């Protein structure tokens, strides 16, 4: 579920792996993706594809490696999911960040690279984009139903690029009080844009999961892919 041979060092010297789709066409923006809690797995894949097939080049970095190095869990057999939530439990996510920073500048440098790179993360990898995107190291970024935003609002003035996210009014990670803190926390800050899909919840966009809404999902892809769009040279 890895690109044989890729190895990026991390601050620390840590090193992983990633899953690479060159662009159809070069050079093109590259679009780094943040992984959910299982891994770089199908979904991770599927991603990459449809990135690829929309005139992006794309990277998804193993983020687990530091605990874990190339797993990949099927969401829909019940032993894989409890060692995604073990895993996800012992995440580090400042070391995540410094990871991810490292593919993206990885990301700049590709010969079939146009220099502008974009975040997408979804689920643990929504919350790592809202954490990349107050350190300003994309281009743009976008989240779709990060867990725990609520806690990161004192870093909303810290945000200079544009990031976007999308939260399902059903998501039991995020109660009715919640919502009211992103919302208007957010919304303090015009570089941060959030939609709500009203009859959605968590993971409306992955077709394995049972909470799939095929309409949310289609506007909140359609959305992502304008966003990206001014990446494109």
Known sequence: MLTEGISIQSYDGHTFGALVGSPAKAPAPVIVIAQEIFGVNAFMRETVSWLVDQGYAAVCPDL??????????DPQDERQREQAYKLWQA??????????????????????????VGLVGYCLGGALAFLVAAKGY?????????????????????????????????????????????????????????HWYEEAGHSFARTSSSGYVASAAALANERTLDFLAPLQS
């Open 138 to 194: 994309v281009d743009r970024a976008v989240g779709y139903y990060g867990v725990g935003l609520e806690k990161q609002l004192n870093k909303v003035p810290e945000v200079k690029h544009p990031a976007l996210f999308h939260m399902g009014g059903q998501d039991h990670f995020v109660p009715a009080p919640s919502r009211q803190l992103i919302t208007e926390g957010f919304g303090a800050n015009p570089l941060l844009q959030v």
């Open 91 to 116: 995440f580090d996510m400042e070391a995540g960040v410094g990871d991810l920073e490292a593919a993206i500048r990885y990301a700049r440098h590709q010969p079939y690279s146009n220099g502008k």
């Open 64 to 73: 687990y490696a530091r605990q874990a190095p190339g797993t990949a869990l």
